[PDB]
Amino acid sequence: SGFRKMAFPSGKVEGCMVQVTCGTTTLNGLWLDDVVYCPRHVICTSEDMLNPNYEDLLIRKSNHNFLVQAGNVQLRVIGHSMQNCVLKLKVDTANPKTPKYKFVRIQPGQTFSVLACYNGSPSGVYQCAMRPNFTIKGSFLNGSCGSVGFNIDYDCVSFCYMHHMELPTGVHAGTDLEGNFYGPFVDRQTAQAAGTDTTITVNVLAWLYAAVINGDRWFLNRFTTTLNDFNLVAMKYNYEPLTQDHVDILGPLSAQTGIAVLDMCASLKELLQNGMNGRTILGSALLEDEFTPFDVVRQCSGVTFQ
Amino acid sequence: SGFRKMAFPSGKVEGCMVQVTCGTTTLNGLWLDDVVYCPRHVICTSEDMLNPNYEDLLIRKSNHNFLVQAGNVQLRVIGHSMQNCVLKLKVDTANPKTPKYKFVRIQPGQTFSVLACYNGSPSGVYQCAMRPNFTIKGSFLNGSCGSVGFNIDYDCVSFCYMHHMELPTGVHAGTDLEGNFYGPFVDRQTAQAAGTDTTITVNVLAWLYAAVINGDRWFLNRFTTTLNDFNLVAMKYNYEPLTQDHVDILGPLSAQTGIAVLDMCASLKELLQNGMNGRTILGSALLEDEFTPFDVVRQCSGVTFQ
Ligand SMILES: *C(=N)[C@@H](NC(=O)[C@@H]1[C@@H]2[C@H](CN1C(=O)[C@@H](NC(=O)C(F)(F)F)C(C)(C)C)C2(C)C)c1cncc2cc(F)ccc12
Ligand SMILES: *C(=N)[C@@H](NC(=O)[C@@H]1[C@@H]2[C@H](CN1C(=O)[C@@H](NC(=O)C(F)(F)F)C(C)(C)C)C2(C)C)c1cncc2cc(F)ccc12
């Protein structure tokens, strides 16, 4: 038992991280087969980054303008190109540690592990959700651009996120590995801002089920509610609507606990209207929304990866 | 910016995990050089584990009673011995992935990363503190015994914890890597129980400093307090006493924020007496005590490991 924000083991990703230098800018790259992926704003200078023009900036660069450090070993760049907001640096060595991988784009509401990196050196790993407003509440300092987010499905790494920038509220914005931003953000220094967020309802319900599995039951009640009357209540407290597909996804968790999905919604309703009255759930005094139903089945059942 | 419970990159530990089978019991082992370390209760049966007698049980075993799986590769056990509560299985192959390592025993109040493992296969990584009562609030299911806790200091893995057992409150107990239990727990099936805990005061203060660095300031005040009058207040709310050495350890964080340690104690005093009045700190509605001053300097400054 127990319940933690748990990241995937990071070793397979650690073996892909490298340092990319262009000019006086150093950031992180992802080395898979003979390509290094990194944020294209590496080619910008301080005054470039105000309103930059990346096709112009890139034609003025040469392969030798890019220094790639794999540990204490240098890699010749033998080619370069831009794909959307990432750079693809072709190098003369295939990464012998290349795992089986995929480039996937995730949905707001889904979770992933982030291997925070500086100078190509992994610093720490932690779990994030893609917020409904397409930001992530990460932990990132200067030099962390190019760090990636990922999931692991048995032996295959599905890369979903590359870090580009921190917004003024202290949340983080980036791209999928094809260089397309999550949300309405651009790799320029404008006045862009997150935009209003919502709470991920289906995830909160999944986490209430994790609590019941781990013995917290005080918030249960005999009451019930209909999907419509619940979705009424979610809308007032700035929660996302719950769909029938969310109810279906919660099926396994409902069956394991014996608590019908709509009954747990009645509990959530009461928790939203009454607060928690000084009690806690899974060590939290807030309703937690960054565990998916998958995540809960994962720790409360115990699946591994090889 | 941002602040997360962040684990160390786990790759160096992942390359050490193996599966140990003896009879019908399977658990995890740690393979360093030519030795596999694992909980000695692997040699027990269901009826053995009531009041077991390990020297007797071990002399009845042979090297071939121990099946060791390193991935899909078997390792001959060529020797076995007991050291306190762990088994040392000498195998015929040195682990080529053996990192630089140390076996260290930690203090209640310190933190570490846990690589949860099943059947020798890493499942997830997360951050824990050693509670004042020598338990850890982990996340562990059947088969997770033998999973290890660790810290990384540049390139060297300091192993501090091996998982043995779950107590009835759902917290976890185990040993250091020399086989000596943390706290008053035994690898028998008795009625043993955690025993009363306290909140780790110095860690809460470190986390308030992390909040100030990340822009939460509402809990600040001009007030001050003396160490004695604060330690008075800690004792009522079941917080550990704060020592002058704790104040010294908080020095760097005090200097970076401009908030004297004893001033932050006055803030903590008010937070304990008044609650938080519906506000949050670093996304928490509770005072968090599982980040050390080191941990805070680590994310709010950005140190890596190679
Ligand atoms: C990566 N190592 C670094 N990010 C950047 O350098 C990006 C990149 C240009 C500036 N920038 C920013 O993150 C800035 N933010 C913004 O322009 C905006 F708020 F998002 F609009 C800023 C002001 C330096 C934070 C471009 C936007 C393309 C990076 C990554 N994570 C965190 C930080 C924190 C920092 F203090 C500095 C740099 C960070
Ligand atoms: C490891 N794979 C497993 N732990 C054990 O098998 C240990 C080990 C014997 C029983 N045990 C326990 O953890 C039991 N707990 C206790 O006896 C006590 F409460 F701590 F006193 C119990 C009742 C099965 C949980 C010895 C004590 C030496 C393990 C590890 N982590 C979590 C779990 C959860 C489980 F449900 C079962 C086994 C677990």
Curated annotation (Swiss-Prot), chains A, B:
Phenotype when changing residue 132 to H: In strain: Omicron/BA.1, Omicron/BA.2, Omicron/BA.2.12.1, Omicron/BA.2.75, Omicron/BA.4, Omicron/BA.5, Omicron/BQ.1.1, Omicron/XBB.1.5, Omicron/EG.5.1
Source taxon at top rank: Viruses
Annotated compartments: Host cytoplasm; Host Golgi apparatus; Host nucleus
Catalytic activity: TSAVLQ-|-SGFRK-NH2 and SGVTFQ-|-GKFKK the two peptides corresponding to the two self-cleavage sites of the SARS 3C-like proteinase are the two most reactive peptide substrates. The enzyme exhibits a strong preference for substrates containing Gln at P1 position and Leu at P2 position
Annotated control of activity: Inhibited by pyridone-containing alpha-ketoamides compounds 13a and 13b. In turn, alpha-ketoamide 13b (tert-butyl (1-((S)-1-(((S)-4-(benzylamino)-3,4-dioxo-1-((S)-2-oxopyrrolidin-3-yl)butan-2-yl)amino)-3-cyclopropyl-1-oxopropan-2-yl)-2-oxo-1,2-dihydropyridin-3-yl)carbamate) inhibits SARS-CoV-2 replication in human lung cells. Inhibited ex vivo by michael acceptor inhibitor N3. Inhibited ex vivo by compound 11a and 11b.
Domain Peptidase C30: 1-306
Active site: 41, 145
Cross-link (Glycyl lysine isopeptide (Lys-Gly) (interchain with G-Cter in ubiquitin)): 5, 90
Record topology, Cytoplasmic segments: 1-306
Record function comment: Cleaves the C-terminus of replicase polyprotein at 11 sites. Recognizes substrates containing the core sequence [ILMVF]-Q-|-[SGACN]. Cleaves and inactivates human TRMT1, preventing tRNA guanine(26)-dimethylation of tRNAs. May cleave human NLRP1 in lung epithelial cells, thereby activating the NLRP1 inflammasome pathway. May cleave human GSDMD, triggering alternative GSDME-mediated epithelial cell death upon activation of the NLRP1 inflammasome, which may enhance the release interleukins 1B, 6, 16 and 18. Also able to bind an ADP-ribose-1''-phosphate (ADRP).
Subunit and interaction comment: 3CL-PRO exists as monomer and homodimer. Only the homodimer shows catalytic activity. Interacts with host FBXO22; this interaction promotes the proteasomal degradation of nsp5.
Annotated protein name in UniProt: 3C-like proteinase nsp5
Source organism (scientific name): Severe acute respiratory syndrome coronavirus 2
Portion of the parent chain present: 3264 to 3569 of 7096
